[PDB]
C-alpha cells in the first residue's frame, strides 16, 4: 500500500519496503518518488556542488538492493551520453530543471548518434530510464539556476559507459561519490 512520503526520511523508509523483495515495481517506485514534495532543508546536507562539474552524493545504500543519491548540477553542467548497467534508474527533480535527451543504442558501425527525443524535467517530476529504453544525456541548460536531483538505481552500480556522440563508440567509466551520507569523500 503506497502512501505519500512526508519527508525524505519517510521516502527512504518506504523505498526499503518496496525493495524488500527480488523484483521492482517500477510504476510504484516512480509514483512514490514523484509524491515526495521536495523540501530543501531535508536534503541540504547532501547538496554539495562543485564549480566545474556535477556531483554525486550518496544518501542511502538501500541495504544492498538500491543506491539513492543526490546529484548537484551547476549552471551549464551536464552528463555524457550514457547507459545504466542493466539497472533501473529513477531521477526525480528536487530543484531547478534538467534537459534529458534520449538516444538509441548505436549500431556497431561508426555513426553520429542522433537524438530520438528530448524533454524538460521539472521540479518534483520523476523520470525513469533503463537500458531497454535507451541511452540518455542529462544537462542543466540554465544560465542562472543550479539543479538538484534525486536518483535511485537498482541494483546499485558504479560503472557505466559513456558514448561519443560523433561515432557511437563507448568507453567504460567508473563513477565516484563526491560525498556519502553528508560526508565529503575525496
Ligand X SMILES: N[C@@H](CSOO)C(=O)O
Q: What are phi and psi of 167, to 5 degrees?
A: -135, -20
- The verdict on 56 binding ligand X (CB under 6 A) reads yes
Q: Per-residue string for binding with ligand X, 82-101, x by CB under 6 A?
A: x------x-x----------
- How far does Cα 89 stand from its chain's mean position? 6
Instruction: Please report how close the Cβ of residue 109 comes to ligand X at its closest, in angstroms.
Output: 26
Q: Which is nearer to ligand X, 8 or 121 (CB)?
A: 121
Binding residues for Fe cation, as ranges, are 82, 84, 136
C-beta closer to ligand X: residue 8 or 85? 85
Contact 149, 98 (CB under 8 A): yes
Note the helical H segments in the chain: 8-18, 26-35, 40-43
Quick check: helix, strand or coil at residue 44?
Answer: helix
Residues touching ligand X, count (CB under 6 A)? 9
Residue 38 and residue 95: Cα distance in Å, rounded? Answer: 8
d(CA 149, CA 93): 4
Distance between CA atoms of residues 43 and 23, nearest Å:
28
- Based on CB atoms, which residue is closest to ligand X, 56 or 168? 56
Look-up of cell digits 563526491: 178
Our finding on whether 15 is near ligand X (CB under 6 A) is no
CB of 84 to ligand X, least distance (A): 6
The least CB distance from residue 153 to ligand X, in Å, is 7
C-alpha cell read off for 7: 519527508
- Residue selected from 67, 79, 85, 179 as contacting ligand X according to rule CB under 6 A: 79
Candidates 77, 88, 151, 170: give the one binding ligand X (CB under 6 A): 151
The residues of the shown chain that bind ligand X, judged by CB under 6 A, are: 56, 71, 79, 82, 89, 91, 138, 151, 175
Amino acid at each position: 500500500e503506497l502512501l505519500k512520503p512526508r519527508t525524505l526520511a519517510d521516502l527512504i523508509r518506504i523505498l526499503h519496503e518496496l525493495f524488500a523483495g527480488d523484483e521492482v515495481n517500477v510504476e510504484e517506485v516512480q509514483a512514490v518518488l514523484e509524491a515526495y514534495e521536495s523540501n530543501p532543508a531535508e536534503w541540504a546536507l547532501y547538496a554539495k556542488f562543485d564549480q566545474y562539474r556535477y556531483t554525486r552524493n550518496l544518501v542511502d545504500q538501500g541495504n544492498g538492493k538500491f543506491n539513492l543519491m543526490i546529484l548537484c548540477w551547476g549552471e551549464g553542467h551536464g552528463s555524457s551520453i550514457h547507459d545504466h548497467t542493466d539497472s533501473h534508474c529513477f531521477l526525480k527533480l528536487l530543484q531547478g530543471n534538467l534537459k534529458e535527451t534520449l538516444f538509441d543504442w548505436p549500431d556497431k558501425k561508426s555513426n553520429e548518434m542522433i537524438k530520438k527525443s528530448e524533454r524538460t524535467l521539472r521540479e518534483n517530476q520523476c523520470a525513469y530510464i533503463n537500458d531497454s529504453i535507451g541511452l540518455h544525456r542529462v544537462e542543466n541548460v540554465s544560465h542562472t539556476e543550479p539543479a538538484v536531483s534525486l536518483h535511485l538505481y537498482s541494483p546499485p552500480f558504479d560503472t557505466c559507459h559513456a558514448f561519443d556522440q560523433r561515432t557511437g563508440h563507448k568507453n567504460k567509466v567508473t563513477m565516484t561519490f563526491h560525498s556519502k551520507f553528508g560526508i565529503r569523500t575525496p
